[PDB]
Amino acid sequence: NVPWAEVCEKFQAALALSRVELHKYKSKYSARALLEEVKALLGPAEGPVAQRAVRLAVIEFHLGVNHIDTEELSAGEEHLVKCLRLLRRYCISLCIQAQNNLGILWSEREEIETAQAYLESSEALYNQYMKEVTEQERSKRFEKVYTHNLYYLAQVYQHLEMFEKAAHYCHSTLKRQLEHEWAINAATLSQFYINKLCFMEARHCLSAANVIFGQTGKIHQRKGEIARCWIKYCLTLMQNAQLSMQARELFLLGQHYVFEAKEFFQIDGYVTDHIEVVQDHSALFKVLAFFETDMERRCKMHKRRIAMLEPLTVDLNPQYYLLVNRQIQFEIAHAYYDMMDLKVAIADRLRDPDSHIVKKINNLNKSALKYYQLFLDSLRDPVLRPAMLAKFRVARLYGKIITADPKKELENLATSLEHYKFIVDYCEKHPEAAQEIEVELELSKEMVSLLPTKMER
Amino acid sequence: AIKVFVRIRPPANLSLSVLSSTSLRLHSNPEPKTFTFDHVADVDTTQESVFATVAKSIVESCMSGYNGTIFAYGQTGSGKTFTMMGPSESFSHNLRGVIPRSFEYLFSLIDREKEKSFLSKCSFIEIYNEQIYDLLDSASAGLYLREHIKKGVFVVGAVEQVVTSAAEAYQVLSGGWRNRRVASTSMNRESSRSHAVFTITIESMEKCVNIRTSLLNLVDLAGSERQKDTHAEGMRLKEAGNINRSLSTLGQVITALVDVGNQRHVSYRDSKLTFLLRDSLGGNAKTAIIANVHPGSRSFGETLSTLNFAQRAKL
Ligand SMILES: Nc1ncnc2c1ncn2[C@@H]1O[C@H](COP(=O)(O)OP(=O)(O)O)[C@@H](O)[C@H]1O
Ligand SMILES: [Mg+2]
């Protein structure tokens, strides 16, 4: 049998080459050749000495890393399940190393049912290890393999659906890593919380990301990461507005956060981050309907937001810009829709026919129909349900807003009627609101076939 | 719609039988299974037949201004280098690749179409260890990608050259491929490891104004090795005895892929390679796909994963 000095120099040569062949034409082939040379050197052809048992365990681990170097683990799978069978017949760490290689081999089997069953038995072994029956008192390497098998059970959890289970256990992995670049892990935890509805541990991990960036530890990609932290701050404010719609200090902290956001957004470029800028700024300037005069002030403020967006995006124009600006002019169209509602409110509650007032509101109306005509150029006249909503909106804009000479209203309702006919022979599918514009088109066809014959003469 | 055009390198335990050019029969070990595609090129088809039918039809339709997305792709031993670059420089028409044939065909279309004007843009890039390299200058290394407000996505450090004719394109392409030979002596050990992208972007003026753009990619991605290619409906399993800091960073970003929701904003912080490709897949152009492939006896399971990737391209 192999004595102590010989097995130590065999261990040293094996680990030395297996960890020097990864730093960096056929070096890994000769590396596999020398590892199978060590496999020939072992001589494959309490009770007894248990040092031979821990030796056979660690060289079967070396056989497993040899087989994953070959990526032909089948005979390695059979020899490793024989080794873990004879180890299951009988302990401190041989069981946990066998469990790591066992999870690795059934992971490389690449079938979800048997891998997940062997991984639930792995969870049984993990809690049987965590019942509490060198580098630092036999705890440090145990800690790093605890990170190893916790991340691999997170991997088998995300192989299934298991959303809350993988989220709770990935929380456990990041908290175990935080026992002794992590803001993006807290970002994904809070993004899971955005996909869910509970939002207290979301705020707790925002504060955790803030304190681990304030205490990062120093003897970079952070700009976009804290940018997404601003994004999820205003998404938490969006969720608050959702639960309050479908107080003042929330808007104040949102304003301070979006100003600091704006600063760290315009610092770091960029192309698509400005799409995120107009997205969340239009969100926080659209949903915050709580007053009248400051409502007009924030409407003028988001008109200023799109006005500083505009004069370099007109030069931009990808086809990708046609897509994303179709969504942006869709948002600006909804902004002009509830600003039209605000206009009829302030026309009911204030003397509208003053000259600068009617000039400003027909300027906004002609800008709204100009952007609607731009949406018409988005369809090549020479997935579609927002286009039906835009058809509803251009039909209402063709119906109501005209204060000029009553001659374009009939041809405008005729164009919306033939567009409605085009939809009902192009899709034959139910709309969401266009039955209201159907009966509205019927009654407006009746009234503009009746009344201009009496008022235009 | 997606037109998948697909070339197969002659394997000479193929286990493949071909009933027609559209459909292949793949005998497998559990059970055989038939795979149908739009266009599958076989052993017996020539370089000129694929060039003429596939490449000439798609390059003609590309001349209208749509970016038909021609690309070479494959695993190790896929047959890309022979058909596009050629094995060595030793003017030999069949042995030199389809790329100068595309050059002479495009400049034939240019001078028979020529009534700023029709403008050529060509660029060679290779990506090793997630770093941009240009073969024109050795100093050109680690240059950063940027999508400009032109709609032209480009490498910031790179400088393009205009080319008047296919002979100067052969001189520049042979100089870049010779820099690939010298680069094979350099830190670019394997073509499997690097991501070598030659792109051809062809500009046109209407008459003098409006700009028409076609893209011709020569991509040399990861090969048959099993470390990369970010998403897989096979092994979504990061496999490695490494430091769980980096393993957990990838575990985080795949956990974000869990945290989509039940309207995919396609990821751009994933990889710069797929951003330089995300201008193409899901782009606003015709979805013309020239793709090179090779089925393999040895990694039969991974070539089943590539055939499933071809069905994923079909859907
Ligand atoms: N269509 C083909 N006909 C004959 N031999 C080919 C063909 N395609 C590739 N080969 C040969 O196969 C080998 C590997 O091809 P290569 O293009 O280098 O694959 P890859 O580019 O994926 O490494 C080369 O020696 C090449 O000459
Ligand atoms: Mg190659």
Residue numbers in the entry:
A (entry chain A): 3 to 26, 33 to 53, 84 to 128, 134 to 176, 195 to 241, 248 to 286, 304 to 330, 392 to 527, ...
B (entry chain B): 26 to 37, 48 to 125, 128 to 152, 158 to 250, 254 to 307, 310 to 362
What does the report in the manuscript say about this coordinate set?
Kinesins are a superfamily of microtubule (MT)-based molecular motors that play important roles in cellular functions such as mitosis, cell motility, and intracellular transport.
We built a model of the complex via flexible fitting using our KBP model and the KIF15_MD crystal structure. The complex is arranged such that KIF15_MD6S sits in the concave face of the KBP α-solenoid, analogous to a baseball enclosed in a baseball glove. When the structure of KBP-alone is superimposed onto KBP in the KBP–KIF15_MD6S complex, it is clear that KBP undergoes a conformational change in the presence of its kinesin motor domain-binding partner, with the largest differences resulting from an unfurling motion of its N-terminal subdomain. The structure of the KBP–KIF15_MD6S complex revealed that KBP binds the kinesin motor domain via the tubulin-binding subdomain. In particular, there is a striking lack of density in the expected position for helix α4. Instead, there was a strong density of length and width consistent with helix α4 displaced by ~15 Å into the concave face of KBP, which we modelled as such. This displacement of helix α4, which lies close to the TPR-repeat region of the N-terminal subdomain of KBP, is accompanied by additional rearrangements of the flanking L11 and L12 in KIF15_MD6S (labelled KL11 and KL12).
